[PDB]
Design an enzyme around this catalytic site. Structure first.
Site, PDB file in Angstrom:
ATOM      1  N   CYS A   1     -53.544  40.871-101.418  1.00  0.00           N
ATOM      2  CA  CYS A   1     -54.130  39.683-101.415  1.00  0.00           C
ATOM      3  C   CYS A   1     -54.052  38.753-100.134  1.00  0.00           C
ATOM      4  O   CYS A   1     -53.170  39.150 -99.226  1.00  0.00           O
ATOM      5  CB  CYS A   1     -53.477  39.507-102.595  1.00  0.00           C
ATOM      6  SG  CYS A   1     -53.764  37.730-103.382  1.00  0.00           S
TER       7      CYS A   1
ATOM      8  N   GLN B   1     -56.836  36.430-114.227  1.00  0.00           N
ATOM      9  CA  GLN B   1     -56.643  38.015-114.839  1.00  0.00           C
ATOM     10  C   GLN B   1     -55.775  37.940-115.943  1.00  0.00           C
ATOM     11  O   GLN B   1     -54.728  36.955-115.488  1.00  0.00           O
ATOM     12  CB  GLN B   1     -56.564  39.058-113.713  1.00  0.00           C
ATOM     13  CG  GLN B   1     -57.778  38.782-113.081  1.00  0.00           C
ATOM     14  CD  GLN B   1     -57.977  40.511-112.506  1.00  0.00           C
ATOM     15  OE1 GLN B   1     -58.214  41.346-113.254  1.00  0.00           O
ATOM     16  NE2 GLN B   1     -57.921  40.462-111.087  1.00  0.00           N
TER      17      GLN B   1
ATOM     18  N   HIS C   1     -49.350  44.318-109.726  1.00  0.00           N
ATOM     19  CA  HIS C   1     -48.584  42.796-109.255  1.00  0.00           C
ATOM     20  C   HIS C   1     -47.198  43.658-109.362  1.00  0.00           C
ATOM     21  O   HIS C   1     -47.200  44.146-110.478  1.00  0.00           O
ATOM     22  CB  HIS C   1     -49.226  41.756-110.026  1.00  0.00           C
ATOM     23  CG  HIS C   1     -50.734  41.591-109.926  1.00  0.00           C
ATOM     24  ND1 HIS C   1     -51.655  40.766-109.384  1.00  0.00           N
ATOM     25  CD2 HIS C   1     -52.016  42.504-110.834  1.00  0.00           C
ATOM     26  CE1 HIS C   1     -52.664  41.020-109.332  1.00  0.00           C
ATOM     27  NE2 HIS C   1     -53.080  41.979-110.742  1.00  0.00           N
TER      28      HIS C   1
ATOM     29  N   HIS D   1     -47.074  36.282-105.970  1.00  0.00           N
ATOM     30  CA  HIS D   1     -47.677  37.894-105.793  1.00  0.00           C
ATOM     31  C   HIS D   1     -47.871  38.883-105.251  1.00  0.00           C
ATOM     32  O   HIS D   1     -47.485  38.786-103.779  1.00  0.00           O
ATOM     33  CB  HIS D   1     -48.273  37.969-107.193  1.00  0.00           C
ATOM     34  CG  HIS D   1     -49.313  37.840-106.921  1.00  0.00           C
ATOM     35  ND1 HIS D   1     -50.714  38.894-106.901  1.00  0.00           N
ATOM     36  CD2 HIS D   1     -49.870  37.490-105.765  1.00  0.00           C
ATOM     37  CE1 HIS D   1     -51.613  38.619-106.620  1.00  0.00           C
ATOM     38  NE2 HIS D   1     -51.599  38.060-105.714  1.00  0.00           N
TER      39      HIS D   1
ATOM     40  N   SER E   1     -57.721  44.073-110.533  1.00  0.00           N
ATOM     41  CA  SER E   1     -57.304  44.157-108.625  1.00  0.00           C
ATOM     42  C   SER E   1     -56.043  45.058-108.358  1.00  0.00           C
ATOM     43  O   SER E   1     -56.819  45.396-107.700  1.00  0.00           O
ATOM     44  CB  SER E   1     -56.899  42.025-108.504  1.00  0.00           C
ATOM     45  OG  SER E   1     -57.230  41.082-109.320  1.00  0.00           O
TER      46      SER E   1
HETATM   47  C1  LIG Z   1     -55.548  33.563-102.991  1.00  0.00           C
HETATM   48  C2  LIG Z   1     -54.515  32.723-101.597  1.00  0.00           C
HETATM   49  C3  LIG Z   1     -53.797  31.714-101.901  1.00  0.00           C
HETATM   50  C4  LIG Z   1     -53.545  31.289-100.941  1.00  0.00           C
HETATM   51  C5  LIG Z   1     -52.649  30.386-100.765  1.00  0.00           C
HETATM   52  O1  LIG Z   1     -51.199  30.170-101.235  1.00  0.00           O
HETATM   53  N1  LIG Z   1     -54.105  32.230 -99.798  1.00  0.00           N
HETATM   54  C6  LIG Z   1     -53.774  31.804 -98.510  1.00  0.00           C
HETATM   55  N2  LIG Z   1     -54.947  33.038-100.523  1.00  0.00           N
END
Ligand SMILES: Cc1cc(CO)n(C)n1
Length: 147
Positions: free
Chosen positions: A97, A115, A141, A43, A138
């Site tokens: 994110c 979510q 997306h 996402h 959040s």
């Molecule tokens: C949330 C989230 C999940 C991941 C791994 O793909 N990261 C780096 N951050």
């Protein structure tokens, strides 16, 4: 008639019918093609001032409005769909994110973990498909289902 959540609509500017999915907010000219325990998605999140946590690795204080965040989402979708830009590239550069550092990959997940609007869109996407703007607490997306 159509897969889960699809319906016919009419383009206001062209008069040509199209297909809109009210679960994923995807829209396309072509009639939609053809549920798993798990899906895998990436996402691109755009946060805004009303986000659950208005901060990210990109910005200590996220101050943009939801409407500004949606306009950014709309523009990224445009560049992905035109092929000007890849989803993975934009996610790495602009997702609010922590998963930006993995080109937006979240890994696989079941129902009950994300979510709810995100979850529903993820599981309504066919493998390979991308959502429209999906709204959660959040932020906003763009979801890409990879598995
Ligand atoms: C949330 C989230 C999940 C991941 C791994 O793909 N990261 C780096 N951050």
């Amino acid at each position: 008639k159509l897969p889960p959540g699809w319906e016919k609509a009419m383009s206001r500017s062209s008069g040509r019918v199209y297909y809109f999915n009210h679960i994923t907010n995807a829209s396309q000219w072509e009639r939609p093609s053809g549920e798993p325990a798990r899906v895998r998605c990436s996402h691109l999140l755009v946060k805004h001032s009303q986000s659950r946590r208005p901060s990210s690795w990109r910005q200590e204080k996220i101050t943009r409005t939801k409407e500004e965040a949606l306009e950014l989402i709309n523009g990224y979708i445009q560049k992905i769909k035109s092929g000007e830009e890849d989803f993975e590239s934009l996610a790495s550069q602009f997702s609010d994110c922590s998963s930006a550092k993995a080109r937006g990959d979240l890994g696989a997940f079941s129902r009950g973990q994300m979510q709810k609007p995100f979850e529903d869109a993820s599981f309504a996407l066919r493998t390979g498909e991308m959502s429209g703007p999906v709204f959660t607490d959040s932020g906003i997306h763009i979801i890409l289902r990879t598995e």
